[PDB]
Design a protein around this nucleic acid. Structure first.
Lengths: 273, 273
DNA sequence: CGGCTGGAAATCCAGCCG
DNA sequence: CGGCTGGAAATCCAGCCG
């Protein structure tokens, strides 16, 4: 049998809550979770409907999936890992009370050792190989399902990882969001200045990526134009066509080069002068 | 005999260093210190001219003047208090190396225990009477001078307090500053929207103040328009002559209602339509 | 020009909700 | 009323400098 993630956890937007903030870090939602149609991380067992257990652990983002210092807090959790009994007459399991509790860079080693003492290393990464810095701003859910083979003895399936979930509070990879702009229109020739009010960004890793069909451009500014990480003053780039005949709706977005992530597109309408 | 402060400390303008920030720079100034030509807290002892000692410690700032959790650091300081041999041949004693090192409120309890342990409590406030909430943003210097009586045996003169000293690292105390404005001109009818980028302010306590000879208006905005304390979006007020036929250079600046403090002004050209 | 350090950046709670 | 939610409060760097 095999596990497959029918519904991935949302990647950006939620922050990892610290132990000082509470005993539950809210609930990780599915990627397609909308205000109208809510969803939760769901896995699918192919080739098995019956008695079993599931354990959700946290592991590192990049290849050597060392168990992560952070904790999975919520219903049925303990030791930084979720665990319960699979519904025996169902093959789909969504997890709605999954919350991530981050450690302090100080209580890191202490965190590590709990993973060790509690035997939480799905990819059995070696003590030798466990060495190294940990990205604290990113983790991955690691579903470990145990069904039973046809004989009847318990059967542990292979571990399935999810795409990384990122800490929204981290200045380093928080969700890119444009909150207010001084004007969503301008001349096709470009040159209009714009005050963009956004969330925390990093001046040495941010752009205002303009985008139209078979067209794209980048607004113009320098690091010094980034105000306290939450505002950018840039000049709009000229459209593809300087000789415009009427408004031309395009899209304005925030792009963090390093991971090529984008923000929801804001509509910007070019005009002729 | 009696100590007399003929040079009270500067109440505002001083930030209390956290131990984490190390040495860096620190010297409580006089109620008129400046340039290279400064001024420091100076006391004068009346009714004495000979040998003695002075100890300056921090007390709270309200009636049960308890030995504050903060610290006095710098030359001759020890255990959160200063103490040096008052000059035998001088009556006016100035202090030029006084620095208030604040404690994180997670050290509070062990801060008070050092005040007792070291017998720091000019006013002799009892352990049970030492109960209460400590205001960590304001301290009072307590000059405790000890001279000799006629028999020559050490004589301690009554504790002399300075008026409260306040912090700068407070959220509503730092300088008011306008960093970038989207427009420094507009209609005499007002109503034009402005995107002003500023130093951290408190939306609950700030406003944009326009002024000219016998004339003063304020930019119109709500708390929702203050973006992360470092940016404000407001609309200009109609000028005095809302039917100009020529420009009028008025002045625009930030104002903190709490203390009516103002930022360096920024010019504003009102014009006709 | 390699350190010193000031500014910039990283690391509890009021108001919402149901 | 208990969780939330999202703001704010607390607690490495460039550029100067010797």
């Amino acid at each position: 049998p095999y596990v497959e993630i029918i519904e991935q956890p949302k990647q950006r937007g939620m922050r990892f809550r610290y132990k000082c903030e509470g005993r539950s870090a809210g609930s990780i939602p599915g990627e397609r979770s909308t205000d109208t149609t809510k969803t939760h991380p769901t896995i699918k067992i192919n080739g098995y409907t019956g008695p079993g257990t599931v354990r959700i652990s946290l592991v590192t983002k990049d290849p050597p999936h060392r168990p992560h210092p952070h904790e999975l807090v919520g219903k049925d959790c303990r030791d930084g890992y979720y665990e319960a009994d699979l519904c025996p007459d169902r093959s789909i399991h969504s997890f709605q009370n999954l919350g991530i509790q981050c450690v302090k860079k100080r209580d890191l080693e202490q965190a590590i050792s709990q993973r060790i003492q509690t035997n939480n290393n799905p990819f059995h990464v070696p003590i030798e190989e466990q060495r190294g810095d940990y990205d604290l701003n990113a983790v991955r859910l690691c579903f470990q399902v145990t069904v039973r083979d046809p004989a009847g003895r318990p059967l542990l399936l292979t571990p399935v990882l999810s795409h990384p979930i990122f800490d929204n509070r981290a200045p380093n990879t928080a969700e890119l969001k444009i909150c207010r702009v001084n004007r969503n229109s301008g001349s096709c020739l470009g040159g209009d200045e714009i005050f963009l009010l956004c969330d925390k960004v990093q001046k040495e890793d941010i752009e205002v990526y303009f985008t139209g069909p078979g067209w794209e451009a980048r607004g113009s500014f320098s690091q010094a134009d980034v105000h306290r990480q939450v505002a950018i003053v840039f000049r709009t780039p000229p459209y593809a066509d300087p000789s415009l005949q009427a408004p031309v709706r395009v899209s304005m977005q925030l792009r963090r080069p390093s991971d090529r992530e984008l923000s929801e597109p804001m509509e910007f309408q070019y005009l002729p002068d």
